PDB file of C-alpha atoms in Angstrom:
ATOM      1  CA  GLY A   1      97.888 108.331 101.003  1.00  0.00           C
ATOM      2  CA  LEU A   2      99.250 108.380  97.429  1.00  0.00           C
ATOM      3  CA  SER A   3      96.222 109.701  95.507  1.00  0.00           C
ATOM      4  CA  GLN A   4      93.447 112.384  95.389  1.00  0.00           C
ATOM      5  CA  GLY A   5      90.645 110.676  97.288  1.00  0.00           C
ATOM      6  CA  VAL A   6      88.569 112.151 100.104  1.00  0.00           C
ATOM      7  CA  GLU A   7      90.422 111.075 103.335  1.00  0.00           C
ATOM      8  CA  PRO A   8      93.840 112.853 103.676  1.00  0.00           C
ATOM      9  CA  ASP A   9      97.022 111.208 105.024  1.00  0.00           C
ATOM     10  CA  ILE A  10      99.259 114.055 106.326  1.00  0.00           C
ATOM     11  CA  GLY A  11     100.046 116.940 103.895  1.00  0.00           C
ATOM     12  CA  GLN A  12      98.020 117.592 100.701  1.00  0.00           C
ATOM     13  CA  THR A  13      97.741 113.885  99.780  1.00  0.00           C
ATOM     14  CA  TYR A  14      94.901 111.344 100.062  1.00  0.00           C
ATOM     15  CA  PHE A  15      94.028 107.610  99.700  1.00  0.00           C
ATOM     16  CA  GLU A  16      92.627 105.882  96.553  1.00  0.00           C
ATOM     17  CA  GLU A  17      88.988 104.822  95.795  1.00  0.00           C
ATOM     18  CA  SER A  18      89.728 101.091  95.858  1.00  0.00           C
ATOM     19  CA  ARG A  19      87.060  98.576  96.867  1.00  0.00           C
TER      20      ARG A  19
END
């Protein structure tokens, strides 16, 4: 992901809180 959400992508990065 490219944000600081709750679900990670691979390293220390995460998806956005979009609807």
